[PDB]
């Protein structure tokens, strides 16, 4: 009985951080946009 | 924050460009001259 209680508590604990991963996943979209902007600049300077 | 000033982040803004375009004409119109002076 006590072992089952422990397992439930631990899974509940993991769920919160697995949810918190998504915001850190959004910062990646920020970085992706910034990289594409730097590429814009490099292209236009090469053409210049 | 370290590279706010490098032109790599300032020059092209293909999504929201920074400049407008103005056109200027230079002319003169001679009228009723010998053919006084305008």
**Residue B3 structure tokens:** 């590279």
Closest CA to B14 of A32, A37, A25, A29: A37
Q: At what resolution in Å was this solved?
A: 2.9
Which chain B residue is nearest to residue A37, measuring alpha carbons? B9
Within 8 A by CB and 6+ apart from B11, the residues are: A41, A44, A45
Contact A37 B9 (CB under 8 A): yes
Collapse the DSSP code of A40 into the 3-class scheme (helix H, G, I; strand E, B; otherwise coil) and give the result: helix
| Chain A interface, Cβ < 8 Å to B | 37-38, 40-42, 44-45
B19: closest CA of chain A, how far (Å): 16
Method of determination used here: cryo-EM
Structure tokens belonging to residue B28: 């003169």
Any residues with CB less than 8 A from the CB of A45 and at least 6 apart, and which? B11
| Alpha-carbon span A26 to A32, nearest angstrom | 10
Rounded Cα distance between B32 and B38, Å, is 7
Return the beta strands (E) in A1-48 as ranges.
none
């Amino acid at each position: 009985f006590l072992t089952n209680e422990l397992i439930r508590l631990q899974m509940e604990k993991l769920d919160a951080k697995l949810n918190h991963l998504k915001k850190l996943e959004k910062f990646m979209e920020l970085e992706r946009k910034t990289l594409e902007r730097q590429q814009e600049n490099l292209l236009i300077q090469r053409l210049n | 924050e370290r590279s706010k000033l490098s032109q790599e982040f300032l020059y092209p803004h293909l999504n929201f460009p920074n400049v407008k375009f103005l056109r200027i004409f230079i002319s003169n119109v001679s009228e009723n001259q010998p053919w006084n002076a305008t």
